[PDB]
Amino acid sequence: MAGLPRRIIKETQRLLAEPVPGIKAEPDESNARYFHVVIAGPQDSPFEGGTFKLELFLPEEYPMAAPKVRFMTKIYHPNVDKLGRICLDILKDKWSPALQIRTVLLSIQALLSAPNPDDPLANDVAEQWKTNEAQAIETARAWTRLYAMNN
Amino acid sequence: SHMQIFVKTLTGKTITLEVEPSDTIENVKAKIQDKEGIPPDQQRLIFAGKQLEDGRTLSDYNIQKESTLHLVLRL
Amino acid sequence: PLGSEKTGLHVHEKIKHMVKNYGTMITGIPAEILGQNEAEISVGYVKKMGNMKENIAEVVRKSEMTQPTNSAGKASNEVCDLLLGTEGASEFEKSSYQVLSGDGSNLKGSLPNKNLLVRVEMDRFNAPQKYQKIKREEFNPETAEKNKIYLLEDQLVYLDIFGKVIDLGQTSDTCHRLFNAITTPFYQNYILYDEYIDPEESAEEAAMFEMGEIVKAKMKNIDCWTATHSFTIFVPESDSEDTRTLYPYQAYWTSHTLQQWFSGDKDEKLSRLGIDGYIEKLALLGTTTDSKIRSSIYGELFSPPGKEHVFCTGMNEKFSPLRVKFKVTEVNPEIALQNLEEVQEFIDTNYPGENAKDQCELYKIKAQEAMTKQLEMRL
């Protein structure tokens, strides 16, 4: 709470008070601009029953600039690269302070239910998603059970 | 101090712009809009293999007299 | 004039059928030229170990040069070129845009019962969201972050998208008061309209609020409009005023081509709104201030087919004002049909095939061959 504009303090408290369903997001003790995030694999998606760990970080320029987010758990998704980064891409526009931490988290969650392999970040993964969606989904189920079912 | 650069597309069509070395990349995109009727939000510019970012400036990429930019129309 | 409408709809049906089946080939560009230029732009992405020539193939496999443009502006240029001919398009380009009036009426009154082409350009109001205190000694317009408010000890200025400094008309007394009230380190360089800032809380927070009110009032007379989207509407002549349809044609950056728009029949689906229903949605897009209705209408009018309800949610909610602008011109069906028929013969001649998919693939392999050879000869 120390050293922060009222907006970050209140975004934080309202995330803790009324968390996004399926998402746990709590700030680190030593650093309040850093959030330890856990997103559950949506139901009826290849990631169901998984529990994916992510890092969400508010740089010094937040909220003028978007949060940085990274997956920590490996995941087989056409929009997550080998290093855990996601496409928070706003078409025909840029990040704006009208967007919030909650919006970023809801978008990642939605993206797990709606993979988009036509505008990709993980190419190998996206190729197989467009070409062989059934095999891509099976592999993701296997990745989920190997990497995301005990932390 | 005005100067002149070229913008080329995949079809080989080339246009000529008059610009200043301090001109922002969004000013360049608006000059492309003036010539071609293409919105800035529907343009990507490439110089020397790298993308020209909004909010930066022509000199920040060291773009000078008679440089050829590449206008990408599929992303 | 019973059966009179179908010579415009044949123009519509021909361009739709050809774009659907031929994609980028309707521009009439020979496959060789496409491959040659893609080659020159591609040289630097090559891996130069092993036999570079086998990874040249890796580059040619990597090519997307036959996939159609998804620039909304470029697709509009192509629709204009096909339907009006190169010279007609050039005359249409010279006429001025009209700002769509609040109720759309100026556009409805610009659609007499002839075959018409509408071009639309839509702007988004790109006003500053950020400010920073700065000393005059430290402020350099060329290098400073653009589209930003700068509060100096004796001046309040707006550094616009073109790096020009616009004074905001405040006395040095007012600026000195505002500068000296905003003292907290993390409010020296911040955002303008924070919903959590309370003018009744603090002298600093009242100064931040007052500066936002000043900037907001001044931006109302400053041109912050930047073109964001472009499309066309074909409006064939009809047999009765109440049975007239329009057909919107668009591509959309990083989202879809005009081929894909046509394949999902969004032109037909939107056509079912009628002229008044479509105009009314288009007119509301610009008058509403409810970001949820703006996003919902934007989604309905401009998403790729089937994404109307997800297109402008979440990260892509439409927070900024939009303004629709239009221009209208008459289309000669003989000219547009002759244009389309010349392109069809060009394609049939130079890229023969039993079906359209084979002509497309022959075109693609010809372009790949020309790219392969050019990249070979320069490495």
Numbering used by the authors:
A (entry chain G): 1 to 151
B (entry chain C): -1 to 73
C (entry chain B): 3 to 381
Can you provide the manuscript's text about this entry?
Recently, two L. pneumophila effectors MavC and MvcA, were identified as structural homologs of cycle inhibiting factor (Cif) effectors. MavC catalyzes the transglutamination reaction between Ub and UBE2N, leading to UBE2N ubiquitination in an unconventional form.
To gain insights into the catalytic process of this non-canonical ubiquitination, we purified the MavC-catalyzed non-canonical ubiquitination product UBE2N–Ub conjugate to homogeneity, and cocrystallized it with MavCC74A. While the overall structures of the three proteins remain largely unchanged compared with the MavC/UBE2N/Ub complex, an isopeptide bond was clearly formed between the ε-amino group of UBE2NK92 and UbQ40 in the MavCC74A/UBE2N–Ub complex. Structural alignment with the MavC/UBE2N/Ub complex reveals a marked movement of K92/K94 loop region in the MavCC74A/UBE2N–Ub structure, which forms a short helix in known structures of free UBE2N, to our knowledge. Structural alignment also showed that M317 of MavC undergoes an obvious movement during the catalysis, which might play a key role in releasing the K92/K94 loop towards the active site. Whereas MavC expressed in the ∆mavC mutant induced UBE2N ubiquitination in infected cells, expression of MavCM317A in strain ∆mavC did not cause UBE2N modification in cells despite the mutant protein was properly expressed and translocated into host cells.
